[PDB]
Design a binder for these strands. Sequence first.
RNA 1: CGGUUUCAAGCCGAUGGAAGUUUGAGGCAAUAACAGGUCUGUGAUGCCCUUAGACGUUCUGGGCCGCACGCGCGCUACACU
RNA 2: AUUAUUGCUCUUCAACGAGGAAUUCCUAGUAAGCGCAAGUCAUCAGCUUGCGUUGAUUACGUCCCUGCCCUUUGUACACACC
RNA 3: GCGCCGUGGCGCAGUGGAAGCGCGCAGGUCUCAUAAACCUGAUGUCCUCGGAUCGAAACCGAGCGGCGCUACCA
RNA 4: AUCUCUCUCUAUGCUCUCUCUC
Lengths: 90, 252, 62, 111, 70, 145
Amino acid sequence: ETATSNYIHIRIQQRNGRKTLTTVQGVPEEYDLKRILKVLKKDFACNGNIVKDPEMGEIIQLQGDQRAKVCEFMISQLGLQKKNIKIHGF
Amino acid sequence: TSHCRFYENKYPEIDDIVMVNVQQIAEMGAYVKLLEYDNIEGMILLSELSRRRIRSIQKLIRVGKNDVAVVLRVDKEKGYIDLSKRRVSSEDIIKCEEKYQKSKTVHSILRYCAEKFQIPLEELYKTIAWPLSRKFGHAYEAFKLSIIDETVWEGIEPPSKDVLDELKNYISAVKIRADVEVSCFSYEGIDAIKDALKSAEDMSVKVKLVAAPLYVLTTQALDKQKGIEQLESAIEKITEVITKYGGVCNIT
Amino acid sequence: PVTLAKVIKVLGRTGSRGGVTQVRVEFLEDTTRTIVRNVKGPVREGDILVLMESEREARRLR
Amino acid sequence: NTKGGKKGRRGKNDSDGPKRELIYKEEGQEYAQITKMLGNGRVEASCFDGNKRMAHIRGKLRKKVWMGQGDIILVSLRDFQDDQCDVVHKYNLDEARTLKNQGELPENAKI
Amino acid sequence: AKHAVVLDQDKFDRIMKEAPTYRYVSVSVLVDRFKLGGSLARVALRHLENEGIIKPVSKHSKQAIYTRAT
Amino acid sequence: SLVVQEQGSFQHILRLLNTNVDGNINVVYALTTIRGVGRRYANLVCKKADVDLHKRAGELTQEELERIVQIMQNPTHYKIPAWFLNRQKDVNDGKDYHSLANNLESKLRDDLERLKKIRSHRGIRHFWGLRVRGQHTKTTGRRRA
RNA sequence: CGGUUUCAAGCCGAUGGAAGUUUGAGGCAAUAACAGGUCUGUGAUGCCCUUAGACGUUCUGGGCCGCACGCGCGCUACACU
RNA sequence: AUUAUUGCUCUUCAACGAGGAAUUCCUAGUAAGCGCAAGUCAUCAGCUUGCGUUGAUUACGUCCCUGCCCUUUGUACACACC
RNA sequence: GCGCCGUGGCGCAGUGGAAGCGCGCAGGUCUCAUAAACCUGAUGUCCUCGGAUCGAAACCGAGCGGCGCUACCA
RNA sequence: AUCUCUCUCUAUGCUCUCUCUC
Ligand SMILES: [Mg+2]
Ligand SMILES: [Mg+2]
Ligand SMILES: [Mg+2]
Ligand SMILES: [Mg+2]
Ligand SMILES: [Mg+2]
Ligand SMILES: [Mg+2]
Ligand SMILES: [Mg+2]
Ligand SMILES: [Mg+2]
Ligand SMILES: [Mg+2]
């Protein structure tokens, strides 16, 4: 048995200019990370960067203010659920 | 006033690994207090503070915080310390940290006694920490040895036995985990297990019930390594004593 | 070790920040040597300049 | 200061005040929350009525008043067309709150 | 200073026997060599200077400059 | 000036008027530690008593202390007029009082209570936790409670 | 005077001098502008507005001095001088 | 005169152990300390504006950062690098 | 009940004197402006309560919550 | 024939426009 709802944290990270960054915390480690990053890069105008945390956690970077759009994209391309998302900041 | 150096001799040696608590930044670097050797002031000249150019000074070094360091220039006459942070090799760092920790622990030991009775601190230092160091190298090692088997305290006498007793108490029952997984599914299996436990627990510790097949006992340790010898005995009992019952038991 | 040399002529003033003088040092112990030295601060002609450095010399400061 | 100080902002002068009178509804003109701020002067803005619409910036505010996401806005709907509509007046946050309190706009969206 | 503002008899005796050998005598000096700390040190100094004991150099108050007889 | 060495007669740290009076502070400045007692007025009290100020805190004999206490608690009889004491004129008796130790605070509390009862501006401010005596809270008082 | 510099322009040092930094500091400050600042200096005004229950006017009372906060000036101090 | 106008007497004695990253000002009667008078003013200076007492330290230079000046240079820029 | 995380906010780690890292919010500084880049934070002592020992969040207990063991213990 | 020889990050910025009489 596996938990259906895990806390995925889409945070506000301050990027160059008045612009921001979609940073994802608490990523499910089941699918290939690099592949997902590549997919994300392809779909938007973003660059994918992964910051590694020991034992559990990987910070996934996507340059820009999308949030909802990103979530929609994730929903469209299988690998991540609908309920797992949380917007953090404002 | 409380003072006196961490090690045996008054003055630091060349290429000695230290840990430095940052006081204030000036021009050369910082007038730091060396926490591996007394509290004598020295400096890290702006060239050997970091391996690479890091621009920021108050994030990689930080005022109030400790830094892994090495002593470069020493002048055995009055008191100067030319110091480095860069010359400390990869790894090595861990060792230095450990040493620092040991030193801190040693320091912690030597103040309670003073508090209890005043009397000159230098004398106290002489009669507790130095002879052992001279014999071996570091006081923490000596302490460890004592803990393992009490013989280093017999060498040089403490001011009173009370202090020694207190130290012993501080050092001291230590809980060691012992898990038993009995392969039983029968109705009268639990009872059998209990019976087995009662023949092994007696004559010397704290048995906790988690499940019918799983039983978790905590064994007491008086001198830290005394708990391993009891565990071994218990294990032996499982293989030798529990044979008349015919209950299959497994150890994790 | 202690050495001292008299200054005679100034070879201008060099430094990113500036201020630091380039001097021509002549040794009062054997006048055969006239070396290019880095001197910090106000310095004229005919001054005794103590040197902890014995032989090392540099010109430009960058 | 307006946005970013600048050498090139002192040749403008803005006059409206924070203590300005709030504008009410008209005929062929109603209130919208902004769905998503689009490019080239276009903007996707869901009306408080119950129609999706496509909103468009018409002059005036094109450089003077900058706008963001999820804002209460006066939209004069096209009388001849319907799908394309135009933004007339941006409402302040305080203003929006006051409107909400009044109950002039339907209570469905948050500031 | 942990109090030490007492013109104690023992303290006085100590002062009497420790002010010679040392050339310089002052309140600060006294404080340094652990006897009296502060205001009454001055008083002690004054009452050491009635006739002899320690000779004055200072013609000024606030700072005292005194040398024992050789 | 005193050449007198003094033997074991003075006992440091004294319990006078409930509040603890500490050691070797200069009589006047030893008395200042007590609430209601303040510098100049302490000095005046000492003068009235007729004890030399240039003495230790432990030095004081009991009688002198008693006298000082009397001077403090009953001030009017020993030539101390109006430009002198704590609650001049007063709101409760008409007579003026030099309130002390655990009295002044109580009086203040009472005043505050009365203000609250009668809903005055000062009282309101006190209730709030705000600055009263002509201050601009644009910058003033960011320390809070 | 003394030297230096195509020995011109000048400069650094010394003497004498109340004084040798243009003797110190000012005050006036060119052309060209800025979409700087102000109609809240004016009887300096164009234009639009309100013009009699007045945005005019004065009297009474507040208010600009409010305070969870964030900056900018300044003052007092952190003591032995 | 309450939302102490100010002043004076009293008592009340907090934060504050020389101040992070940052940054202003200054090369001689100057810096700073210290006042005073004036301006405002019926009353009030912590403010400005002018004096005068006390009087240092270190430069007499460089363009490294921040600007500026001209000369050359390159500009797909003249709303002129915002 | 055991084990770790017990915060100064989240998310990561370390056990005997030293305010631990990455992010976030709150605020500053630098630049004409924002961001990067920088510091300072907030319940003052790193669960609740106190003690042995000067002390400490760390040593010890009674008392809580999340999961690593259990399977409903008549 | 007299040179001597220095060094690195720094991303972006949206708000118009103007002639006379010979
Ligand atoms: Mg303008
Ligand atoms: Mg000439
Ligand atoms: Mg002139
Ligand atoms: Mg007008
Ligand atoms: Mg009317
Ligand atoms: Mg005002
Ligand atoms: Mg100003
Ligand atoms: Mg006023
Ligand atoms: Mg650009």
